[PDB]
Amino acid sequence: PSDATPVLDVTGKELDPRLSYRIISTFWGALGGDVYLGKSPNSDAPCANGVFRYNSDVGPSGTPVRFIGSSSHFGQGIFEDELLNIQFAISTSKMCVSYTIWKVGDYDASLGTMLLETGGTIGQADSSWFKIVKSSQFGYNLLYCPVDQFCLKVGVVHQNGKRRLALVKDNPLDVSFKQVQ
């Protein structure tokens, strides 16, 4: 437990839960690529249920997200180290609304870890809770907090030639947040 430290966007402005953000690299070239919503390979989901990032920044911009803090504090803005749900902030059909909400998938034996998916819930005991922390390198990392040494880093594994976000032990994905519009 610490003093509220707001998360900032790429402009230095505090993140607001009332706004949407792309989760971007802040490297450019083949190192860049924003996070986006995509189809998981040979998935039985009726809607896109994969959390990926593009393979470079010469390509489209990512899928905007919003951050939804728990019933605790919340605190006006979005603060480091506070539990939240993550949701892609897009229009879908009624049946796909759940498949905007981030969750952690089951263990995937092809990749030796749990992949990030959508199809989750918000604000509930079965929801996937994440938190944003300052990277030891640059920008921020997203951590998954089931139920620093405790929550599990979100990183990338390579899946069929794509960057798929997943739980990692080392080399977390370093990100920045860029407000939509």
Give the C-alpha separation, 172 to 155, whole Å: 4
Phi and psi (nearest 5°) for 177? -125, 130
Assigned fold of 1-181: Trefoil (Acidic Fibroblast Growth Factor, subunit A) (2.80.10)
Phi, psi at residue 78, to the nearest 5°? -115, 125
Report phi then psi at 127, rounded to 5: -75, 150
CA dist., res. 121 & res. 20, Å (int): 18
Cβ atoms of 73 and 79 closer than 8 Å: yes
Token pair, residue 172, equals 């977390």
